[PDB]
Structure 1
Amino acid sequence: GETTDGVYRVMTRRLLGSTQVGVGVMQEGVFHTMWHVTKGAALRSGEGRLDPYWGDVKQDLVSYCGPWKLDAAWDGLSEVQLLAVPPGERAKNIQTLPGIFKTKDGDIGAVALDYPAGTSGSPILDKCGRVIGLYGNGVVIKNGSYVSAITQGKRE
């Protein structure tokens, strides 16, 4: 299959036409996405098969072909870019200064950008181009608007 580093769409044919269910990142031979996208199902890369290697429903993360590789973190100060990949639409950077999720277990970066559910797994970048986490797990606020977490795994 195609193993070139970069961002990919997650497609199924099981429904009407071809449906984009999410997005992911390929880095160092490993494909990174959110658990609610694939539910831990295997994936096809042309004729290649991708098999789940690690995953945690609580983190809402999953990795294919190897351990989670993305270990970059928001610095707490700088603007970021969401590399959004919406269904049927071209990849598109959106610069933003992230907010904060305050939890009993500590503070998480957050991005206030509403996109379709099928955008889940789109990466968030720092100024040096490194992936600081994935978009697609968050909350609906008083308004009705969506705020994603900046979700990041641990590199072992």
Structure 2
Amino acid sequence: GETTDGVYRVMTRRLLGSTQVGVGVMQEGVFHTMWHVTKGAALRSGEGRLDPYWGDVKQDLVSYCGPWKLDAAWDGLSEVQLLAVPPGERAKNIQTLPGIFKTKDGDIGAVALDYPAGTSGSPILDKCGRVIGLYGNGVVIKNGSYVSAITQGKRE
């Protein structure tokens, strides 16, 4: 099916009507998304089929048709863009300065933007347009707002 690079919606017809469960990135022939969006299930792209290739529940990432290709990283200083693809709404870039998730295994950038759960898998970009991570896995702070980690995979 469609293998052109770009951001894509992950849809399902199992529920009422057509429901958007997430978003993903097509790059170098590989579809990248978050694990909790597909649960590792096969994907359809028109008549074609995309089979899972690599995945990990702890990282919350999954790749289709090949290994993880995205390896750009947040520089720890600059503003980034969340290319949000919300359910039923047009792709729209949102600029923000990320915060930090301090963990026992190092620090990770984090974006404090609130979107429907179906926006999970939307890419976070640097000024060069490179995907530095995906949106959709983080925490809910005291006032009820959402903070997502800038989740990046490893390129082998």
TM range, smaller chain = over 0.9
**Which ranges in structure 1 are unaligned for 5 or more consecutive residues?**
none
Q: TM-score, normalised by structure 1?
A: 1.00
The CA deviation at 1:72 is 0.2
The CA deviation at 1:39 is 0.1
Q: What secondary structure is seen at the aligned counterpart in 2 of 1:121?
A: coil
**Which ranges in structure 2 are unaligned for 5 or more consecutive residues?**
none
Partner of 1:150: 150
The CA deviation at 1:90 is 0.2
The CA deviation at 1:56 is 0.3
The CA deviation at 1:78 is 0.3
User: What is the CA deviation profile of residues 6-47 of structure 1, one whole-angstrom value per residue up to 9, with x for unaligned ones?
Assistant: 000000000000000000000000000000000000000000
User: What is the CA deviation profile of residues 100-138 of structure 1, one whole-angstrom value per residue up to 9, with x for unaligned ones?
Assistant: 000000000000001000000000000000000000000
Partner of 1:4: 4
The CA deviation at 1:141 is 0.1
Give the 5 Å matches for 1:1-156: 1-156=1-156
The CA deviation at 1:48 is 0.3
The CA deviation at 1:97 is 0.3
Quote the RMSD (CA, aligned, Å): 0.2
In structure 2, C-alpha distance between the alignment counterparts of 1:82 and 1:104, rounded to whole Å = 26
In structure 2, C-alpha distance between the alignment counterparts of 1:105 and 1:119, rounded to whole Å = 27
In structure 1, C-alpha distance between the alignment counterparts of 2:34 and 2:66, rounded to whole Å = 15
The CA deviation at 1:149 is 0.4
**Runs of at least 4 residues of structure 1 off by over 3 A?**
none
In structure 1, C-alpha distance between the alignment counterparts of 2:86 and 2:129, rounded to whole Å = 20
The CA deviation at 1:66 is 0.1
In structure 2, C-alpha distance between the alignment counterparts of 1:108 and 1:75, rounded to whole Å = 11
Q: What secondary structure is seen at the aligned counterpart in 1 of 2:53?
A: strand
Q: TM-score, normalised by structure 2?
A: 1.00
User: What is the CA deviation profile of residues 62-118 of structure 1, one whole-angstrom value per residue up to 9, with x for unaligned ones?
Assistant: 000000000000000000000000000000000000000000000000000010000
Q: What secondary structure is seen at the aligned counterpart in 2 of 1:89?
A: coil
